[PDB]
Amino acid sequence: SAAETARRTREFRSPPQEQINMLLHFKDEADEEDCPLPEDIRQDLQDFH
Amino acid sequence: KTRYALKDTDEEVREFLQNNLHLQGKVEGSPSLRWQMALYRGLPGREEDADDPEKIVRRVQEVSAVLYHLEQTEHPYKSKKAVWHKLLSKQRRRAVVACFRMTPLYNLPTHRACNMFLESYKAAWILTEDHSFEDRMIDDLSKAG
Amino acid sequence: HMADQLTEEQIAEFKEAFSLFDKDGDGTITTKELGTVMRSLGQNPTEAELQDMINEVDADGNGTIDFPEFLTMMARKMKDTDSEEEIREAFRVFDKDGNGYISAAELRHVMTNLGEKLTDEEVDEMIREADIDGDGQVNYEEFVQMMTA
Numbered sequence A: 001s002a003a004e005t006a007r008r009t010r011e012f013r014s015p016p017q018e019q020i021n022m023l024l025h026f027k028d029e030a031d032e033e034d035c036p037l038p039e040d041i042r043q044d045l046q047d048f049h
Numbered sequence B: 001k002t003r004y005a006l007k008d009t010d011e012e013v014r015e016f017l018q019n020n021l022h023l024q025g026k027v028e029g030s031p032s033l034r035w036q037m038a039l040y041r042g043l044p045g046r047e048e049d050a051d052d053p054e055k056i057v058r059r060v061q062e063v064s065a066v067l068y069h070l071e072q073t074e075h076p077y078k079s080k081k082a083v084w085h086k087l088l089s090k091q092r093r094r095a096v097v098a099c100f101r102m103t104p105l106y107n108l109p110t111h112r113a114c115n116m117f118l119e120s121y122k123a124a125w126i127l128t129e130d131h132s133f134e135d136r137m138i139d140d141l142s143k144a145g
Numbered sequence C: 001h002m003a004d005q006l007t008e009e010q011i012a013e014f015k016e017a018f019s020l021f022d023k024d025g026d027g028t029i030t031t032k033e034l035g036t037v038m039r040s041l042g043q044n045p046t047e048a049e050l051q052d053m054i055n056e057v058d059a060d061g062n063g064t065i066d067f068p069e070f071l072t073m074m075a076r077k078m079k080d081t082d083s084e085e086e087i088r089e090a091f092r093v094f095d096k097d098g099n100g101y102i103s104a105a106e107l108r109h110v111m112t113n114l115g116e117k118l119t120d121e122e123v124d125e126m127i128r129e130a131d132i133d134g135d136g137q138v139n140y141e142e143f144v145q146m147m148t149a
């Protein structure tokens, strides 16, 4: 990869509250690109929801 | 030199000088050129045949290109583009330093991470949830049993 | 604030230290309690200076030291360690490798992480402004006197 590694490490250069906000942002199905979680982990939250 | 400031190649300036050979100064109209021309013509190797239209444009083009690029170096004129600007650093330098030392989520204690999860979950999943019950509730309460 | 200066672990450690001084457990530090731990460390002070080192941190003037005053003492001690060295950490943010110079590539690395982006040419504009020596690298001495890169 190249300079866009900053986009991928943007999570680790953000406050922990903001990190977990990005991880849980996969509800509306229009935000499945910024969220880096695997689909199996996403399913567990949706099952509980 | 003005044509070089307009990003012209060596051919463009030469043809520009070819059509503008009549704009060279006249000795009678300037007092400075009176003594300069007399001093210039006193050199041993100065022949009047050397003032050909082609010979004039060649030397002027060569010197002008050197003169133009020389003042680009001594006077870079790159100022007023990025002056000392203090975009936000003088007050936000602590933030950018703090960004590179921000604690990753996996290093937090479990109880702290759970509290952050609850705040994130309610704002993004519970608040965003849509449940319309007002119409159903009013309809139920408006019925005589 | 205490939360900014101290973490949860540090507060726990300070409470254990406070409980070490307070053998009684009443929640206050008396002169004899303070004197006892000093003797365990070797010092043998008198009550004249023993009271003085209590009044220097005793806020309400009751003559005893409680945990809120003990934490306030430690909070100041953590805060006043750094006075003007904040520029050292700022220099190290731009200085990824760890040497005493800021390279253009290193300046690219931090600029890449930040929001603003450079076209790989204006990066030379501000580095030559900060670097007076003209060696292409901004050292620590050049950074503190004038900060642009």
Ligand SMILES: [Ca+2]
Pocket: C022, C023, C024, C025, C026, C027, C028, C029, C030, C033
């Ligand atoms: Ca006591």
Ligand SMILES: [Ca+2]
Pocket: C058, C059, C060, C061, C062, C063, C064, C065, C066, C069
């Ligand atoms: Ca007290």
Ligand SMILES: [Ca+2]
Pocket: C095, C096, C097, C098, C099, C100, C101, C102, C103, C106
């Ligand atoms: Ca370096």
Ligand SMILES: [Ca+2]
Pocket: C131, C132, C133, C134, C135, C136, C137, C138, C139, C142
């Ligand atoms: Ca230097």
